[PDB]
């Protein structure tokens, strides 16, 4: 500790890499809020969080929501829900509150009105983290008339702030 | 002084081991599909990359048979890994825990010998047990088919070090 700085730390009486830096497991139980063009709904999820090296992984499970717009946002509220000792500031990205287009992936959401769903290929990316809320952008792929949305399991990753 | 991997001697100085930064391997083995009453096997040649505390299984495109709406894909690492990489090297940092890690959307083309129709399935790492990595494939609906066209899929997860 006097001459070593995390993640460099004492490993069995030697200069090594801290096991907490290499792998860390946490959990989040909170609200996933969708905001589209005139559409708003909330869902509660229980997500696994993995912190590996300078990345953080939010492993969202499949959840079911309601109508979505062609263009919308997905918001994760980390001000509450993190399992101690993980804090809200631990989810802050390395680019802080910058607006980005990071981790852009294709997600298939099933839109339905209670019947058999029709799956649309939307575009998801990490856009911004501000005041403990991580905003994901969901747009593209078109839409149909629907009242319910079937969301797949989605893993959201981004660099983790260390300063 | 005393150094602990990945901290090692780099040209007479305290540095990061190049083996920790990048390591390349190969896997030739069986990928088995288990669905609701459906079972088939495929032989694959996969590239393996280990970067920092992650392992990347770069599976190429393979062709299989009927799949269920919900099913699993299993990679048997007990044999097939190119030495000196061992089966235990593929164990994740969460060991044999049941997880939903690296969930991605994969497009599989289902056909009965004709032009395939592509279904957007949901894939994630679920469990590694006794050298077998199990991937979950579900969602997106299905059609009547006899053959499945699988895309190239890269499966990544944290690698155990203790």
């Amino acid at each position, epitope marked *: 500790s006097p001459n070593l700085r995390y993640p460099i730390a004492d490993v069995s009486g030697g200069i090594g890499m801290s096991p907490n830096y290499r792998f860390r497991q946490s959990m989040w139980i909170g609200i996933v809020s969708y905001s589209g063009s005139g559409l708003n709904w*909330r869902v*509660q999820v229980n997500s696994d969080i993995f912190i590996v090296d300078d990345y953080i992984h939010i492993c969202l*499970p499949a959840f079911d929501g309601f109508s979505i717009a062609d263009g919308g946002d997905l918001s994760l509220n980390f001000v509450t829900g993190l399992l101690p000792p993980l804090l809200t500031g631990d989810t802050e990205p390395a680019f802080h509150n910058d607006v980005v287009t990071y981790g852009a992936q294709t997600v298939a959401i099933g839109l339905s009105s209670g019947g058999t769903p029709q799956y649309m290929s939307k575009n998801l990316w990490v856009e911004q983290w501000q005041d403990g809320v991580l905003r994901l952008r969901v747009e593209g792929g078109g839409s149909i008339t629907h009242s319910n949305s079937k969301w797949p399991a989605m893993t959201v990753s981004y660099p983790r702030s260390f300063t | 002084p005393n150094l602990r991997y990945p901290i090692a001697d780099v040209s007479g100085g305290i540095g990061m081991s190049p083996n920790y930064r990048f390591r390349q391997s190969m896997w030739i083995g069986i990928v088995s599909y*288990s669905g609701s009453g459906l079972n088939w096997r495929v032989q694959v040649n996969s590239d393996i990359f280990i970067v920092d505390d992650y392992i990347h299984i770069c599976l190429p495109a393979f062709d299989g048979f009927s799949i269920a709406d919900g099913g*699993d894909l299993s990679l048997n690492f007990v044999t097939g890994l190119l030495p000196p990489l061992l089966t235990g090297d593929t164990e994740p940092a969460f060991h044999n*825990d049941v997880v939903t890690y690296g969930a991605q959307t994969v497009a599989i083309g289902l056909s009965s010998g004709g032009t395939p129709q592509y279904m957007s399935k949901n894939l994630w790492v679920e*469990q590694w047990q006794d050298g077998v990595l199990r991937l979950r494939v579900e969602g997106g609906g299905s059609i009547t088919h006899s053959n499945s066209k699988w895309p190239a899929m890269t499966v990544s997860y944290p690698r155990s070090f203790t």
Partner: antibody, heavy 121, light 108 residues
Framework: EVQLQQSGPELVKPGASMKISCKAS????????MNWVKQSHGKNLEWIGL????????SYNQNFKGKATLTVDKSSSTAYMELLSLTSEDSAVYYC??????????????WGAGTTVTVSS | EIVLTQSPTTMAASPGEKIIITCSAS???????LHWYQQKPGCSPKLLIY???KLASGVPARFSGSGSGTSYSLTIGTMEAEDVATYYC????????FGGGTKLEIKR
């Protein structure tokens, strides 16, 4: 610890309707889901329905559609299930269980004491 | 839709024995949606295992779960007299469903 309290035993005449109350206490967040499970003679567990605060509407099992109606009093933080047109086959123990920690993978991690409903003429 | 089937229906075993109850599903479900409950006589069911192999808060370590696809198994390593109960398996992939119960007895 989050606790769950149900109403007392009920003896109803055939064809009438009874109402059960389920009160939740000691919860750290409000987004938990209320469920109802019926255990008949023979110890058979059948899930009746669930209520989500953010869904604004109850979800019912097709076998219990029309037999039970679930409701919520968010001010008192209590759940209510009403069984209509009770029969001799409806005599059973009725539990309420919540998705407190099991909200994403749908396991009931908190159970009530249960309410035994007897239907006799 | 997804039917669960538990074997055996009843079971008698002396303390120290290793008990294995199996849960068989009609469809292939993710191991994240399979859970086990324990109900002691005169008591309400309690969560035993969630997401196949995760022990609930407070349950003894001798309990463990396992399985994938359509085959799941609850296992007590070394039975104790307290473990006399009826064990249920429940799936959460589709409409909620229980297994039907496995009753544990003492051999005498």
């Amino acid at each position: 610890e989050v606790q769950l309290q149900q109403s007392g035993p009920e003896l109803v005449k055939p064809g009438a309707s009874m109402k059960i109350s389920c009160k939740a206490s000691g919860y750290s967040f409000t987004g938990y889901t209320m469920n109802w499970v019926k255990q008949s003679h023979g110890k058979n567990l059948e899930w009746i329905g669930l209520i989500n605060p953010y869904n604004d509407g109850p979800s019912y099992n097709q076998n219990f559609k029309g037999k039970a109606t679930l409701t919520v009093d968010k001010s008192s933080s209590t759940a209510y299930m009403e069984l209509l047109s009770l029969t001799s086959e409806d005599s059973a123990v009725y539990y309420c269980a919540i998705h407190y920690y099991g909200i994403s993978y749908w396991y009931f991690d908190v159970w009530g004491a249960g309410t035994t409903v007897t239907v006799s003429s | 839709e997804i039917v669960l089937t538990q074997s055996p229906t009843t079971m008698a075993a002396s303390p120290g024995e290793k008990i294995i109850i199996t849960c068989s599903a009609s469809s292939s479900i993710s191991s994240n949606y399979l859970h086990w409950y324990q109900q002691k006589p005169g008591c309400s069911p309690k969560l035993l295992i969630y997401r196949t192999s995760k022990l609930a808060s407070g349950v003894p370590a001798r309990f463990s779960g396992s399985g994938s696809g359509t085959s799941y198994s609850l296992t007590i390593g070394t039975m104790e007299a307290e473990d006399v109960a009826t064990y249920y398996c429940q799936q959460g992939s589709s409409i909620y469903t229980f297994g039907g119960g496995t009753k544990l007895e003492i051999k005498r």
